[PDB]
Design a protein around this ligand. Structure first.
Ligand SMILES: COc1ccc(/C=C(\CC(=O)O)c2nc3ccccc3s2)cc1
Ligand SMILES: COc1ccc(/C=C(\CC(=O)O)c2nc3ccccc3s2)cc1
Ligand SMILES: [Zn+2]
Ligand SMILES: [Zn+2]
Lengths: 183, 183
């Protein structure tokens, strides 16, 4: 009922009082995809497959509306079913996929670019890739012409990097075993 | 090369010639996180845990810079290590996590809202949750006061839904076994 002084962040206890246990109706839900719009799928496919080691697991074309969907994931290309319906059902039940939306023609348009969400207006910030070694990964990214937002040892938090994809989306490069030393 | 008629997107063959096999240096890379900025973590935690059945697996507070990070995932809460360093290392090596960024004070600012990327300027579009039954999941979402962008049987592609979270970010609700029927 009383006005309170500026809280600050939530306490661990406040955050937890806002959390409910998983209802049994949600028990088989999984976080399947993140969708990003890409100007030029040729550049995006080369980046995500060659630079980041992802596999293209499904491509969907919509001839009438004139757009394509590309699903990228860290999956063994030998696990991709060969039959069309089984393939789509396997691809779209993989956890942690990246869905790239290509609105046909944007690749031919000098002015068009997508917004990465890290300048006004902000919202989405980044995807993040966990790697065994941020320094070796980033050395290879440098050699392959990758643009950096943050080199691993530049700024406050060392051993953490941000690169950008061909559309300028930020990608965090993190070692899960080194994040405790920043927290 | 000669000037071409308007883009028909890539052929399956063109898309494949833009893909490289995974370099051995990337072999342990995994798509770990998607980061979204949230105005009010009380509302976002309630939505992602109670409505969507995700588990809060890690909370990080930065008292001096004045922001919190919340990591949400489809994980069994009994798998969360209890000790701080082992917990962070386990949380930040989970596939398919959602990272919510709370810039302290945004919850106390009448005017402030984040941009969902689905109006100018566009980029990020959505996350997507794979569910065993889109219609039962959506019936429950309706009963829980969830705002819809697309009801499963509205629009051209039926059996697919979009809801929005408390910040207005779009969330696709999909059955992997029904997506082949939309191609
Ligand atoms: C663009 O520059 C930066 C530099 C550091 C960060 C810090 C991050 C990444 C993020 O905020 O998403 C950190 N994340 C974690 C997660 C766990 C433990 C410590 C950190 S610091 C973010 C952006
Ligand atoms: C906002 O309204 C819609 C309605 C349908 C769609 C269609 C989608 C979702 C998307 O574009 O990410 C489809 N995704 C797939 C994936 C595989 C096969 C078919 C489809 S249709 C998108 C937005
Ligand atoms: Zn989607
Ligand atoms: Zn992050």
């Amino acid at each position: 009922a009383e006005p309170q002084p500026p809280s600050g962040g939530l306490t661990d206890e406040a955050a937890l009082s806002c959390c409910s246990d998983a209802d049994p109706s949600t028990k088989d839900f999984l976080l399947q995809q993140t969708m990003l719009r890409v100007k030029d799928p040729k550049k995006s496919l080369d980046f995500y497959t060659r630079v980041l080691g992802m596999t293209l697991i499904q491509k969907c074309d919509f001839p009438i509306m004139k757009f394509s969907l590309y699903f990228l994931a860290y999956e063994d290309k030998n696990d991709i079913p060969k039959e069309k319906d089984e393939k789509i059902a396997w691809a779209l039940s993989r956890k942690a996929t990246l869905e790239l939306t290509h609105n046909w023609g944007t690749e031919d348009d000098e002015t068009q670019s997508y917004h990465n969400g890290n300048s006004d207006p902000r919202g989405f910030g980044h995807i993040g890739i966990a790697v065994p070694d941020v320094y070796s990964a980033c050395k290879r990214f440098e050699e392959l012409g990758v643009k950096f937002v943050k080199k691993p040892d530049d700024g406050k938090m060392k051993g953490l990097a941000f690169i950008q994809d061909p559309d300028g989306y930020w990608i965090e490069i993190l070692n899960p075993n080194k994040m405790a030393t920043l927290m």
